Design a protein around this ligand. Sequence first.
Ligand SMILES: CC1=N[C@H](C(=O)O)CCN1
Ligand SMILES: [Fe+3]
Length: 138
Amino acid sequence: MIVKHLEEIVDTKDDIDTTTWNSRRLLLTKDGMGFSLNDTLIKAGTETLIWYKNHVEAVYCIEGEGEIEVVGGETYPITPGMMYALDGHEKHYLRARSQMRMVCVFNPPLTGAEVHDEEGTYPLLAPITDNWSHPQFE
Ligand SMILES: CC1=N[C@H](C(=O)O)CCN1
Ligand SMILES: [Fe+3]
């Protein structure tokens, strides 16, 4: 039996932060379920190109608005309750207008290595700057 909680996973090694998303890993390869499961926040304003050549992924949007454009296919608006699945290993752009909370399922499981690698993703547009700077720490 396995029990976890999002509020324990955030700000933790299972919460992987990138320029365009924040991925809270719920079931890992270690957990041995046959799939990985996470809760990903795609940040407002971002664009990411995505292509998983070695996995199929299901995505279920429970918050926010955006779209997914399939390279060589259609463009599908994302809203709460929309779900898409890349059974065809589709190359695609993922765009968030507001922050999107996505529940995600990978088959086979992603590994910590692939997540940290950012295997299959290419972030193209980051969120707008909050006036921050690396050499500024005031
Ligand atoms: C569609 C997507 N999957 C990744 C994941 O759930 O690991 C998060 C970033 N975006
Ligand atoms: Fe995706």
